[PDB]
């Protein structure tokens, strides 16, 4: 089997992407944030504290003839941005782009933190990291991809995120019309539960490539590109007036600037992030200070190849017995 679903930016900055997902019988369609940095499929629901729902579409398990309470199971998750959610668990039928999994754990939120409530466009998350990170207790649950894998034509999914435009998540096949050149594959460590790999270096604008190993994760659920402070300083030094602002919480730059591109290495290959992809707009409405799309990872503990990087490529998440990642230009 295969599936194919369009993923759409939630706003004009590409802060995140939503993909429609069918849950239950009859189908209830919710728009989920597909997150290769986490491993829980959780939804706003009829169980979510009413004051914490503000415009999201909810899953109502009592209206699904295929929903079953997973008795005793609870979940609780905290994300790198400080947001969180928790609740109980049902199993139900879940379909993405024509690919159907029966018995998928659907984690129903009883509580969500303010940033989730405040984002009316995201009805939940669909985790695509390794199932060892799933938070369900006392019986850990499998991701949608893990459950689908055996049925797929090939044990892969691909992320093709758009810049200010829709893109595609495919399951079970590689669309050879969706990229240019060849795909370069690189080793993955699953030891932390992430799609963790090592970039071979970087360049700033038209500058020379610096060969240096950068371990990090491919994370569709993180907006920006978080890299070591040395690398980020070298980038922003090429932008007149750019500076790190403690009060804003990262590098800012004059909105009048034209940003240089940023290149990262995948083996001997190179992915070029155009400068425009690094502009995240005014820090506050009407400000002439703009927020940068490349930020330091120094306070995180891990480097993160988030959407800023991933949307410059066609990305293969290869879930074969030894997982690997593939990157192609597009």
Q: What is the 3-state secondary structure (H, E, C) of the chain?
A: CCEEEEEEECCCCCCCEEEEEEECCCCEEEEEEEECCCCCEEECECCCCHHHCCCCCCECHHHCCCCEEEEEEEEEEECCCCCEEEEEEEEEEEEECCEEEEEEEEEEEEEECHHHHCCCCCCEEEECCCHHHCCCECCCCCCHHHHHHHHCCCCEEEEECCCCCCEEEEECCCCCCCCCCCCEEEECECCCCCCEEEEEEEEECCCCCEEEEEEEEECCCCCCEEECHHHHHHHHCCCCCCEEECCCCEEEEECCCCCCCEEEEECCEEEEECHHHHEEEECCCCCCEEEECEEECCCCCCEEECHHHHCCCEEEEECCCCCEEEEECC
In the numeric block, which tokens belong to residue 212? 């240096």
**CA-CA distance, 271 to 71, in Å (whole number)?**
46
Give the number of other CB atoms < 10 A from CB of residue 256: 9
**Nearest to residue 15, comparing CAs of 195, 281, 217?**
281
Q: Write down the residue that tokens 């995201």 correspond to.
A: 122
Query: What was the resolution (in A) of this experimentally determined structure?
Result: 1.1
In the numeric block, which tokens belong to residue 255? 């909105």
**Nearest to residue 218, comparing CAs of 201, 241, 193?**
193
175: left (phi > 0), else alpha (psi -120 to 50), else beta?
beta
* Residues whose CB falls within 8 Å of the CB of residue 256, separated by 6 or more in sequence, listed in order: 288
**CA-CA distance, 227 to 293, in Å (whole number)?**
11
In the numeric block, which tokens belong to residue 32? 């989920």
**CA-CA distance, 129 to 141, in Å (whole number)?**
12
Compute the C-alpha angle 164/169/170, nearest 5°.
145
The catalytic residue positions are 35, 199
**CA-CA distance, 148 to 213, in Å (whole number)?**
33
**CA-CA distance, 231 to 240, in Å (whole number)?**
17
- Return the exposure string of 161-183: e unless at least 16 CB atoms fall within 10 Å of the residue's CB, then b: bbeeeebbbbbbbbeeeebeeeb
**Nearest to residue 85, comparing CAs of 52, 114, 56, 113?**
113
Domains of the chain: 5-174 (2.40.70.10), 175-330 (2.40.70.10)
**CA-CA distance, 125 to 10, in Å (whole number)?**
13
Experimental method: X-ray
255: left (phi > 0), else alpha (psi -120 to 50), else beta?
alpha
**CA-CA distance, 94 to 304, in Å (whole number)?**
29
**CA-CA distance, 33 to 41, in Å (whole number)?**
9
* Residues whose CB falls within 8 Å of the CB of residue 183, separated by 6 or more in sequence, listed in order: 174, 314, 316, 326, 327, 328
Q: Write down the residue that tokens 């999994």 correspond to.
A: 101
Q: Please, are residues 323 and 36 in contact by the beta-carbon 8 Å criterion?
A: no
Q: Please, are residues 24 and 120 in contact by the beta-carbon 8 Å criterion?
A: no
**CA-CA distance, 292 to 88, in Å (whole number)?**
38
């Amino acid at each position: 089997s295969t599936g194919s679903a369009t993923t759409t930016p939630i706003d004009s900055l590409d802060d995140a992407y939503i993909t429609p997902v069918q849950i239950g019988t009859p189908a209830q369609t919710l728009n989920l944030d597909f997150d290769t940095g986490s491993s829980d499929l959780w939804v706003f629901s009829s169980e979510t504290t009413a004051s914490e729902v503000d415009g999201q579409t909810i899953y109502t398990p009592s209206k699904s003839t295929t929903a079953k309470l997973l008795s005793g199971a609870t979940w609780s998750i905290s994300y790198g941005d400080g947001s969180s959610s928790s609740g109980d668990v049902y199993t139900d039928t879940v379909s993405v782009g024509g690919l159907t999994v029966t018995g998928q754990a659907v984690e129903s939120a009883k509580k969500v933190s303010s940033s989730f409530t405040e984002d009316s466009t995201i009805d939940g998350l669909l985790g695509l990291a390794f199932s060892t990170l799933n938070t369900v207790s006392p019986t850990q649950q499998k991701t949608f991809f893990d459950n689908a894998k055996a049925s797929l034509d090939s044990p892969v999914f691909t992320a093709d995120l758009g810049y200010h435009a829709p893109g595609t998540y495919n399951f079970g096949f590689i669309d050879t019309t969706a990229y240019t050149g060849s795909i370069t594959y690189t080793a993955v460590s699953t030891k932390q539960g992430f799609w963790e790999w090592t970039s071979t270096g970087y360049a700033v604008g038209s500058g020379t490539f610096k060969s240096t190993s950068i371990d990090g994760i491919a994370d569709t659920g993180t907006t920006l590109l978080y890299l070591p402070a040395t690398v980020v300083s070298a980038y922003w030094a090429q932008v007149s007036g750019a500076k790190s602002s403690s009060s804003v919480g990262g590098y800012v730059f004059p909105c009048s600037a034209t940003l240089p591109s940023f290149t990262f290495g995948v083996g001997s290959a190179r992915i070029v992030i155009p400068g425009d992809y690094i502009d995240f707009g005014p820090i506050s409405t009407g400000s002439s200070s703009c927020f940068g799309g490349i930020q330091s990872s120094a306070g995180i503990g891990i480097n993160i190849f988030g959407d800023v990087a991933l949307k410059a490529a066609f990305v293969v998440f290869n879930g074969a017995t030894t997982p690997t990642l593939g990157f192609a230009s597009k």
